[PDB]
Structure 1
Amino acid sequence: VKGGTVTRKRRKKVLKLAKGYYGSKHTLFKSAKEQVMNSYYYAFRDRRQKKRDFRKLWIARINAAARMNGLSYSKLMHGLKLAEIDINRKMLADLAVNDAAAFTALAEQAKDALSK
């Protein structure tokens, strides 16, 4: 049994996952398999640091727009969870950017709750 067209299907399926690599890779079948493996490590990591990053982004934007209304960067959280309001922080980020009237309404109810 010869080994005719079994290796090339492998190696070209490896290369077609390796287009756009800075240097030699494109054209070396030993050193293009390796960064495919390391790219899979970084893909595994970075699917689980998308979710970390956007919490930090929306927290920073909520902090800015909350300090715009005199409330500190955290007392919105305690104030809304006393007033039983449970928006995701993504949607508080979009309202804090766009709807200034609605964000001031939410901020005044959070002022109203912890004013006991």
Structure 2
Amino acid sequence: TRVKRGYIARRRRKKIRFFASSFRGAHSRLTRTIAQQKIRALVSAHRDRDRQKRDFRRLWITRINAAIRERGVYYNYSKFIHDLYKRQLLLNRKILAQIAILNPNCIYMIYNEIIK
């Protein structure tokens, strides 16, 4: 019972190639190099999904800081966050920063009535 391989090889290497078919140069069209590269692509994806969570937060913090410094001359992000928790107020950084963009009136309003 001789068993030729035939079908089973490139039916998977097509699927391997389906990933890399946006890649630039040799990486897109060379079997074993595609196989080497796909892995690395997936690894960089998995790695950067966790970088995502901290990096968006880090952007938001900068946005909020930039927004809040335009009020009083000496008022600053660090103080602002502790002033939120002093009054018991569970707005997360995403919302705060995005309202700071899309409706600065509302940040003015939150800033006004947190101080007292």
Look up the equivalent residue of 1:109 and give its one-letter code: E
Look up the equivalent residue of 2:76 and give its one-letter code: S
The separation in 2 between residues aligned to 1:48 and 1:101, in whole angstroms, is: 33
Select the residue among 66, 72, 76 that pairs with 2:80. Answer: 76
What are the within-5 Å matches in structure 2 for residues 35-46 of structure 1?
A: 35-46=37-48
- CA shift, 1:3, in A, is 1.1
Matched with 1:64 is 66
**1:76/1:110 contact within 8 Å kept:** no
More helix by share: 2
Question: Unpaired segments of 5 or more residues in structure 2?
Answer: none
Select the residue among 50, 53, 59 that pairs with 2:52. Answer: 50
The separation in 1 between residues aligned to 2:102 and 2:9, in whole angstroms, is: 57
Q: CA RMSD in A?
A: 1.2
Task: Kindly provide the CA deviation profile for residues 15-44 of structure 1, in whole angstroms up to 9, marking residues without a partner as x.
Answer: 111102111122211111011011111011
Structure 1 runs (4+) deviating above 4 angstroms are none
Look up the equivalent residue of 2:84 and give its one-letter code: L
Select the residue among 28, 47, 55 that pairs with 1:26. Answer: 28
Matched with 1:97 is 101
Matched, 1:6 2:8: yes
Matched with 1:17 is 19
Look up the equivalent residue of 1:79 and give its one-letter code: D
When normalised by structure 2's length, the TM-score is 0.89
Determine which structure has greater relative contact order: mean sequence separation of CA pairs < 8 Å that are 6+ residues apart, divided by chain length. Answer: 1
When normalised by structure 1's length, the TM-score is 0.89
Look up the equivalent residue of 2:33 and give its one-letter code: S
